[PDB]
Amino acid sequence: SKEKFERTKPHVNVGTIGHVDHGKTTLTAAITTVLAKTYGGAARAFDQIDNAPEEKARGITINTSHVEYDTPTRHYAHVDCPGAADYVKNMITGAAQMDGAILVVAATDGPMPQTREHILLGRQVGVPYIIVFLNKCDMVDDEELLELVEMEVRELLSQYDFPGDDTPIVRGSALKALEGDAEWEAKILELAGFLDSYIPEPERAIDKPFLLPIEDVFSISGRGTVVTGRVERGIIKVGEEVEIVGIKETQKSTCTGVEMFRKLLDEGRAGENVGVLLRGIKREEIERGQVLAKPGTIKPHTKFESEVYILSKDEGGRHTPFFKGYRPQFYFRTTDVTGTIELPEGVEMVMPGDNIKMVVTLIHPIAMDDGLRFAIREGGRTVGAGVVAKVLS
RNA sequence: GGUUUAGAACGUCGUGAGACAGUUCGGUCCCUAUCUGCCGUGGGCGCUGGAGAACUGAGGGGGGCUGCUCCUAGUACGAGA
Ligand SMILES: Nc1nc2c(ncn2[C@@H]2O[C@H](COP(=O)(O)OP(=O)(O)NP(=O)(O)O)[C@@H](O)[C@H]2O)c(=O)[nH]1
Ligand SMILES: [Mg+2]
Ligand SMILES: [Mg+2]
Ligand SMILES: [Mg+2]
Ligand SMILES: [Mg+2]
Ligand SMILES: [Mg+2]
Ligand SMILES: [Mg+2]
Ligand SMILES: [Mg+2]
Ligand SMILES: [Mg+2]
Ligand SMILES: [Mg+2]
Ligand SMILES: [Mg+2]
Ligand SMILES: [Mg+2]
Ligand SMILES: [Mg+2]
Ligand SMILES: [Mg+2]
Ligand SMILES: [Mg+2]
Ligand SMILES: [Mg+2]
Ligand SMILES: [Mg+2]
Ligand SMILES: [Mg+2]
Ligand SMILES: [Mg+2]
Ligand SMILES: [Mg+2]
Ligand SMILES: [Mg+2]
Ligand SMILES: [Mg+2]
Ligand SMILES: [Mg+2]
Ligand SMILES: [Mg+2]
Ligand SMILES: [Mg+2]
Ligand SMILES: [Mg+2]
Ligand SMILES: [Mg+2]
Ligand SMILES: [Mg+2]
Ligand SMILES: [Mg+2]
Ligand SMILES: [Mg+2]
Ligand SMILES: [Mg+2]
Ligand SMILES: [Mg+2]
Ligand SMILES: [Mg+2]
Ligand SMILES: [Mg+2]
Ligand SMILES: [Mg+2]
Ligand SMILES: [Mg+2]
Ligand SMILES: [Mg+2]
Ligand SMILES: [Mg+2]
Ligand SMILES: [Mg+2]
Ligand SMILES: [Mg+2]
Ligand SMILES: [Mg+2]
Ligand SMILES: [Mg+2]
Ligand SMILES: [Mg+2]
Numbered sequence: 001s002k003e004k005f006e007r008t009k010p011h012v013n014v015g016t017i018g019h020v021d022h023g024k025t026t027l028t029a030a031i032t033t034v035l036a037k038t039y040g041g042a043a044r045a046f047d048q049i050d051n052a053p054e055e056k057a058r059g060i061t062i063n064t065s066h067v068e069y070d071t072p073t074r075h076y077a078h079v080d081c082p083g084a085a086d087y088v089k090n091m092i093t094g095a096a097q098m099d100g101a102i103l104v105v106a107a108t109d110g111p112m113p114q115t116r117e118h119i120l121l122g123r124q125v126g127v128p129y130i131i132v133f134l135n136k137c138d139m140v141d142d143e144e145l146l147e148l149v150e151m152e153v154r155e156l157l158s159q160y161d162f163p164g165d166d167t168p169i170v171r172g173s174a175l176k177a178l179e180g181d182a183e184w185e186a187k188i189l190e191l192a193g194f195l196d197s198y199i200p201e202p203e204r205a206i207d208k209p210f211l212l213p214i215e216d217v218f219s220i221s222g223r224g225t226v227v228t229g230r231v232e233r234g235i236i237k238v239g240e241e242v243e244i245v246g247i248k249e250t251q252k253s254t255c256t257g258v259e260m261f262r263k264l265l266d267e268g269r270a271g272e273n274v275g276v277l278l279r280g281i282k283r284e285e286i287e288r289g290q291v292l293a294k295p296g297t298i299k300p301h302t303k304f305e306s307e308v309y310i311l312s313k314d315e316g317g318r319h320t321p322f323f324k325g326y327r328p329q330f331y332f333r334t335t336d337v338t339g340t341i342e343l344p345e346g347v348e349m350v351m352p353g354d355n356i357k358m359v360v361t362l363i364h365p366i367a368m369d370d371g372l373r374f375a376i377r378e379g380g381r382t383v384g385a386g387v388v389a390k391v392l393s
Numbered sequence: 394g395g396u397u398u399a400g401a402a403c404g405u406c407g408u409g410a411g412a413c414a415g416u417u418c419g420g421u422c423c424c425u426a427u428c429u430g431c432c433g434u435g436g437g438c439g440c441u442g443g444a445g446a447a448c449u450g451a452g453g454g455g456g457g458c459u460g461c462u463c464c465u466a467g468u469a470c471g472a473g474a
């Protein structure tokens with residue numbers, strides 16, 4: 001909180017996706033040390049990406065950490081996702097804000113169950129583009145074995161409905177590029193080139209009014225409570241009226257400084273992860289899931305009609321019918337929430353793989369409008385995608 | 394220290410003397426080693442002229458405990474942990 005962030009080079013939200021213990025977090029560390037040395041940006045290190053007691057004694061990552069590496073064309077903002085089956089909820093928040101992923105499949109093990117689960121969540125939420133990275137390579141000194149893993153990833157993406165064969169697969173060791181090997185430093189400099197080439201300039205919504213979903217809340221010692229998240233639409237000027245809408249009720253507030261990776265900003269534009277400092281709010285009373293909207297634009301609702309598309313076994317979801325009283329988890333912008341289903345008259349049962357509308361009473365109210373996209377999940381897996389039809393409350 | 398002598402007390406049983414793995418406080422533990430055995434340490438003669446050294450080895454004894462840290466490798470194994 002000192003150096004003013006100059007608005008130069010387009011902002012893009014990147015992040016690593018893939019199986020557990022697969023080089024996902026270690027890739028993030030390799031990208032920093034490679035790009036910092038040659039181009040001449042800020043250095044950083046691997047330990048900073050995940051410290052705490054929970055990511056040392058174990059080794060695994062839980063929290064969605066963030067990194068800021070710069071290149072001549074664009075200014076990237078990384079989002080290192082967790083990866084394990086237990087941490088899918090706090091991942092989806094990291095994956096939703098992310099524009100273009102970096103998938104991580106490995107040349108020894110290959111595509112494994114979570115890789116399929118991650119990319120499934122990527123489609124239904126919103127992950128336009130994806131890039132593969134083989135994160136072992138050196139351990140198996142062979143030409144035929146390593147190239148057979150590439151084939152199965154192209155199959156995976158194309159099977160699940162991505163380009164597949166068009167996606168630029170890259171090979172490279174994360175640990176070798178951490179030290180100073182000239183051949184492996186250049187091969188992850190190549191990944192930065194693939195990020196610029198394949199992923200285009202993202203399409204922002206800097207016109208329609210302000211909204212910002214809260215991904216994580218902080219309490220800065222001196223300044224006050226801060227909320228982080230990608231600005232979904234509009235802009236944020238310093239000293240502007242902001243209404244916090246969602247769970248519990250609704251509270252009035254004002255912004256007192258927006259930032260971008262511990263650097264000051266004047267205008268927090270759309271499509272970029274920013275830490276908004278709110279005035280006169282406690283750490284406990286503001287929770288995760290709520291949205292920073294402009295006063296009057298959005299209203300919290302506990303009941304709504306919605307055109308729900310239930311999934312079948314082939315697409316990946318339920319395989320049995322259900323009646324009124326069923327309670328799955330509804331993932332809106334960031335958080336999830338439970339809700340009772342009330343079906344329309346003249347519909348006895350809801351079969352899997354079917355398009356119908358339904359009234360859904362939620363236990364917590366969440367800020368929503370007509371034409372909001374959500375993805376229903378239950379039992380550690382997906383259920384059905386859909387859209388909001390009408391407001392009731 | 395306990396049990397198992399003589400003192401004294403409690404509860405209990407006995408008319409009483411007293412009695413009770415019922416309890417309670419106090420209450421002398423001797424021996425210079427002949428033989429066997431054992432640990433040491435010598436004298437005697439033998440081993441075939443005597444003497445001084447240096448070995449050989451039959452045979453006998455000694456010793457044999459094991460942690461955790463890292464490296465292999467977060468490798469195999471595992472959906473993950
Ligand atoms: N030999 C070799 N090992 C690698 C390479 N890249 C990563 N690894 C190792 O693979 C392990 C995975 O660690 P990490 O990347 O933190 O796990 P992750 O991919 O973020 N998944 P999660 O966070 O869910 O546990 C580490 O031991 C790391 O050193 C590589 O190119 N070669
Ligand atoms: Mg493994
Ligand atoms: Mg990780
Ligand atoms: Mg592990
Ligand atoms: Mg394995
Ligand atoms: Mg396997
Ligand atoms: Mg204040
Ligand atoms: Mg006695
Ligand atoms: Mg007595
Ligand atoms: Mg007597
Ligand atoms: Mg009598
Ligand atoms: Mg007696
Ligand atoms: Mg007795
Ligand atoms: Mg008694
Ligand atoms: Mg007693
Ligand atoms: Mg006594
Ligand atoms: Mg006495
Ligand atoms: Mg006594
Ligand atoms: Mg006595
Ligand atoms: Mg005495
Ligand atoms: Mg004696
Ligand atoms: Mg004597
Ligand atoms: Mg005597
Ligand atoms: Mg004797
Ligand atoms: Mg003897
Ligand atoms: Mg002897
Ligand atoms: Mg002797
Ligand atoms: Mg002798
Ligand atoms: Mg002799
Ligand atoms: Mg003689
Ligand atoms: Mg003789
Ligand atoms: Mg003689
Ligand atoms: Mg002799
Ligand atoms: Mg003879
Ligand atoms: Mg002879
Ligand atoms: Mg002789
Ligand atoms: Mg002679
Ligand atoms: Mg002689
Ligand atoms: Mg002689
Ligand atoms: Mg000798
Ligand atoms: Mg000798
Ligand atoms: Mg003998
Ligand atoms: Mg011998």
Ligand SMILES: [Mg+2]
Nearest residue numbers: 453454455456
């Ligand atoms: Mg021996």
Ligand SMILES: [Mg+2]
Nearest residue numbers: 454455456457
């Ligand atoms: Mg022995």
Ligand SMILES: [Mg+2]
Nearest residue numbers: 458459460461
């Ligand atoms: Mg040992």
Ligand SMILES: [Mg+2]
Nearest residue numbers: 059466467468
């Ligand atoms: Mg290890």
